[PDB]
Amino acid sequence: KHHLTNMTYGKMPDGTWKLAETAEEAHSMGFTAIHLDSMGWSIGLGVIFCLLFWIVARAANAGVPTKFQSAIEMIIEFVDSSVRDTFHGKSRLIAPLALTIFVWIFLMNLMDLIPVDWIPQVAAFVGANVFGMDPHHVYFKIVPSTDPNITLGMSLSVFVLILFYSIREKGVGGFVGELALNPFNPSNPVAKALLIPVNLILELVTFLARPISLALRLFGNMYAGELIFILIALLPFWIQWALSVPWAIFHILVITLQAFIFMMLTIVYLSMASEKH
Amino acid sequence: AEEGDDLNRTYGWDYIYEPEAEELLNGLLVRYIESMVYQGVIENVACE
Amino acid sequence: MELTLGLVAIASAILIAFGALGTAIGFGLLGGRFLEAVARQPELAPQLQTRMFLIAGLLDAVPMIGVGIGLFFIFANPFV
Amino acid sequence: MELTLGLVAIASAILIAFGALGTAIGFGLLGGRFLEAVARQPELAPQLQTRMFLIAGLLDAVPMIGVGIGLFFIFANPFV
Amino acid sequence: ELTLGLVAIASAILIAFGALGTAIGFGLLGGRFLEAVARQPELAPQLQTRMFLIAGLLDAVPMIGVGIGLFFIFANPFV
Amino acid sequence: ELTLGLVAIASAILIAFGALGTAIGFGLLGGRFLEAVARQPELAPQLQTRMFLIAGLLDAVPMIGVGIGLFFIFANPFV
Amino acid sequence: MELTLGLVAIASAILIAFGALGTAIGFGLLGGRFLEAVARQPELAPQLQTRMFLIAGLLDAVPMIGVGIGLFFIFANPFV
Amino acid sequence: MELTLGLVAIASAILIAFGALGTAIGFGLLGGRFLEAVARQPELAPQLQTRMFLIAGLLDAVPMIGVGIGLFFIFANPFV
Amino acid sequence: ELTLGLVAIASAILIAFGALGTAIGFGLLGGRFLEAVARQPELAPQLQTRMFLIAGLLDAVPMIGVGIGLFFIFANPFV
Amino acid sequence: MELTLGLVAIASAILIAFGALGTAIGFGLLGGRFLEAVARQPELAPQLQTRMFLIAGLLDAVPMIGVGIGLFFIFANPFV
Amino acid sequence: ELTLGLVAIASAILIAFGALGTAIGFGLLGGRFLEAVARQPELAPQLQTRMFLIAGLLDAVPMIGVGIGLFFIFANPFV
Amino acid sequence: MELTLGLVAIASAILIAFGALGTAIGFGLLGGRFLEAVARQPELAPQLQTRMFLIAGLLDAVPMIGVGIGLFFIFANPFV
Amino acid sequence: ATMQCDVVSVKESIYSGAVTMLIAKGAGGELGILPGHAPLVTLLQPGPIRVLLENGTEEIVYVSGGVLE
Amino acid sequence: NINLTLIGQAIAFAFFVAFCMKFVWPPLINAISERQRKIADGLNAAEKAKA
Amino acid sequence: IAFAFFVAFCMKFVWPPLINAISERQRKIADGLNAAEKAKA
């Protein structure tokens, strides 16, 4: 049992499933590489979803929609209303950007609602097919979305958007500078200790740990979900199998609010980027 | 009364209610009714 | 070393509980005042709840951060 | 040995007791504000109570998380 | 020796913080309920019903901590 | 030795927390009560009824902690 | 014996010190609210003081118990 | 024994400083509402101050006792 | 050996205090925010904007502490 | 010896620290309402600030005593 | 060895503890500013002037704690 | 001797941190109410700022003493 | 500065014109009023109300029941 | 072992589907129907206006 | 690695979704036109 627990734990924390920078792909102990061999699953899900959208994007629908296109219309109407009412005076085609990032993170965290054991169970047949059976049980499978590497990728992608749209209006003068909270204070030791470090750390903190916190808070929520699953998996005979259900739906609501507020924060950050400094 | 006026002039501000809305409203009702009675009496005088 | 592990367990417990208290206070204040406000203005409840969830999201980031990193050290402890 | 056992037992006590404190007092303030509000408008008791429970559910997530972690650690600690 | 005292003090701080929290919540609820009854003495039946209903929400895990302290005092693992 | 001081400290913590919570919450409650009286001295009888009600609704777990301290002081295990 | 006697001294300090905060802070709350109420209606000062002395006499009884435990220990108690 | 001397030093710091803190808290609590009342009601500010003094002595009694125990132990810490 | 555990503990404390600071400053701001907006729902966006700027004004040194703590978690001076 | 040196130095540090904390809290809570009232009516400021200084000096006394004990040990602890 | 770990602990306490205090102060400040601008959306400019002034004057001694912590981080005294 | 160095670092951290926090909490208290006052009635802003500075200087004094004691422990080395 | 302040009984007006400083005793406490003051409504208590004029002198007007805005 | 977990998980899933349909789908269908009916009413208003 | 990935993913997709929105917005205009038309008559 606890053998099985640790054998599961081999899978989750460090991702990049079967990455090997001149190393092994099924070792769970390489601990030395730079490849992210787990992003592809998230990327493929995003691509297949964006094509699922493209099916209706290449289409023009104006009459009476069925359930599919009806829901499509309410969704797109709400997202366009939100992006529009939030901010304005800005035409560089960002509303689709927010829509896309929101719905992708939506689906990405949604897909993690399955029992943890079923990914390695379905993968065990491929393991019998290729790359071993029990040395796969420790860490050889591709993992669904729990890897903070992916989250880090979204964080810095949005950060790149932030930097580029801050210089959208050539705010380079305001981008290099900042509004210092104070130039100095009396007790001239204080003045010296304030002049150099303080406003610099002020300017730095205005942007740095915000996307970092975004990504690793996603990781915290989603990792928390998976670990709750694994812990409830103890004694599935005399249990009523009702430990999860309340917390599970709560965390579902959490995921919804996650995606929503992340895209909200995207909106406010792009507003500040569209605001001169 | 005044169904289309006096709701425009209230900007993003409100009169602060040092008393509860209830008692101040009651005093307003009292005084406003008495004022109308007064004016009607004066009008009756003029008609006379 | 195992007592160092106990140190780690204590630190994680600190973070998780103590940020949980952060949430327990913030969300409670928001709930109380929100109920009072919506009582004052029972008509525009949609936008009220909208901005309410806005604030709720803005609130509990860092405490949940501490919870997550604490559990991470509980299981993926650096320098076990 | 004994030191680690005491460490984890104290950690569990921290989590559960401290979260219990927070949730208890949070309920106190929340209910006080809810009663104060509903006193103004008895007409909206149903919807107001609906939102009351809607947020009461928001409160208790990580308290229960800590309760579960402490209970399991009571049953089986990590770092055996 | 050490484990005994450590478990005992864990239970003690458990129940002490529980008493603290339940008293604080009692006061918090009480003040505003008194305020409301001062405003609405007439609905005091229904208000009091809601009062005790929400008080039922209050002190679940405090009593849980008290019971866990009793468990530690009487019989608990790792002793 | 160590267990003795641990038990004494734990009992002191229990009673100290009980006293702190009682005093603080109880004082807040009395303040709101006198506030309500200043609102309406006429409902003071019913208000006092509620007072003794909620006082009896506030003192239980503190007295439990008092009993815990007494049990520790007079005769308790882990000594 | 030095260990446990010093710990008992710490414990008595806790006893009396918590009694001190409870009395001081609770009576400060009482004073603030009392002065507010009496200024609201200076006429009913007699009944106000009536209820206030009643509730205050009901107040510090448990602080009195803690201080009395300290007195028991300082005069003579078990474990010493 | 000198370890117990450090213990007593810690306990004394506890009692005296902690009671000072409580006294400050209670003083501010009373003072805020006292000040507001006398500002709004200067004509009766006299008997307001009368009640305020009436309760000022009621406030510090337990803190006074705690400080007294601390200073007595400073002079002569019993359980020598 | 234990000073690595000391580094871990200190980083944890940095994180934990930044957590309460953020979580309770946010609580206060949200309370007052919802309080105010109900008066002038029409004036919501301006207040919202100011509130966002305040939230930014709130959280700087908490991320400073958490960043330095995580740096010490990974890059360890004072071993 | 060294251990007792640290014991007494830490105890003195605590005595000064809690005194500073409590004093700051007291002045802040005083000043809030003082500013509020003096804003309300610019007339009664003289006796207003008179009672303000009265109670402010009334407050920090025990903190000043803790400060005195700390500096007492600073010149020389009444102990080894 | 112990010295470096304890120095790290002390710097961590400094930074985190101060950051929490700065957070609570900014909480009160921003809440009051928000309510003020809610009642008078007009005097916002000079009110924010006061706001930045008072906040810039707010951090000085927690800033000192930060400076001491960083001085420890680069070249700690009492090595 | 390393014990003494750690203890003095701890004492200096205490002295600086708690005093800084006194400054922080008091400054928040003053700032909220001063902002309130200047908002309600902007005309008194000069005298309001005067009172604000008067109380600000009065408050932070003892925390400055703690800061100076920290510096005195840092550069000068008592008990070392 | 100056605020346009008007005092009026139900029958007819009593005072009108700019005023600089208003001192009354509201439904709650006494207050001081200067132009630019927040929007507020208060219940007049019986007694005289005294206000400071642009000339540097101060008017006083008695009230027995009424409301103030 | 594995099957014991699967059976409980499947029970959870069945409850998921049943309760989620029950408590969530009527509002969605209602929204869809309202959208369609308002569009149709606007259309009919168009033809009758031309008439 | 993900940064260029995602920015390139969205950029050479960024136009068609907005191009879609014109249909909806002009559609609403037709409904508005129906209301105005009913009023003039």
Author numbering:
A (entry chain a): 15 to 291
B (entry chain g): 194 to 241
C (entry chain J), D (entry chain H), G (entry chain R), H (entry chain Q), J (entry chain P), L (entry chain O): 1 to 80
E (entry chain G), F (entry chain S), I (entry chain K), K (entry chain L): 2 to 80
M (entry chain e): 2 to 70
N (entry chain p): 2 to 52
O (entry chain b): 12 to 52
Which sentences did the original study use to describe this structure?
F1Fo-ATP synthases are large, membrane-embedded macromolecular complexes that harness energy from the proton-motive force (pmf) and use it to synthesize ATP via a unique rotary mechanism. We solved the electron cryo-microscopy structure of the F1Fo–adenosine 5′-triphosphate (ATP) synthase from A. baumannii in three distinct conformational states. The A. baumannii ATP synthase has a subunit stoichiometry of α3β3γδεab2c10; its overall architecture resembles that of other bacterial and chloroplast ATP synthases. The rotating c-ring transfers torque to a central shaft comprising the ε- and γ-subunits, which protrude into the α3β3 hexamer, inducing conformational changes in the F1 nucleotide binding pockets, thus converting the rotary force into ATP synthesis.
